[PDB]
Amino acid sequence: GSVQIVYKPVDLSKVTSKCGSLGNIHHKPGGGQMEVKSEKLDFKDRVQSKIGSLDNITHVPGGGNKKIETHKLTFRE
Amino acid sequence: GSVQIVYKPVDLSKVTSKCGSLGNIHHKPGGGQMEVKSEKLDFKDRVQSKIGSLDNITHVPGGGNKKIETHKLTFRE
């Protein structure tokens, strides 16, 4: 009782950008005073906890192009 | 009395060709016979003078794509 399998994907994709100018970008957030206090905190298993976070990000990619792929092949008997 | 100038050209142009085949070209001009006559001849100040010319050209560029640009910025006070 034979079994043949042929997983032949083919991918010739493009993910592209041209851009003449990226320019004159400004990021002036005013100051936010923040105060953080606790008695007790418990984080038992697999926790992701952002708490009392002040963040300024200025992410300015000339490209910033992403591609993801995920080939899975699972055989079971 | 200030003067600013900012000459920021940006050029992302393309000038392009694909071609599958050029293929069979023939250039069989028959015979050419000609006469030019004068007594006396002079030239001055950068004269550019083709005379009595028999020419055969077979110019076959696989891609004959041309680009010219000319940025000029000219200040006087």
Residue numbers in the entry:
A (entry chain A), B (entry chain B): 304 to 380
Show sentences the authors wrote.
Here, we used cryo-electron microscopy to determine the structures of tau filaments from the brains of human MAPT mutants V337M and R406W.
Paired helical filaments (PHFs) and straight filaments (SFs) were found in cases 1 and 3, while only PHFs were in evidence in case 2. The structures of V337M SFs and AD SFs, which comprise two asymmetrically packed protofilaments A and B with the Alzheimer tau fold, had also similar cross-sections perpendicular to the helical axis. However, unlike SFs of AD, the backbone traces of the protofilaments differed from each other along the helical axis in V337M SFs. In protofilament A, strand β4 of the Alzheimer fold, which comprises residues 336–341, was shifted along the helical axis by about 3 Å compared to protofilament B, which adopted a typical Alzheimer fold. Because β4 contains the V337M substitution site, this shift may have resulted from the presence of the mutant residue. Small variations among the observed structures of filaments with the V337M substitution revealed the presence of an adaptable region around the mutation site that explains the accommodation of the mutant methionine without disruption of the overall fold.
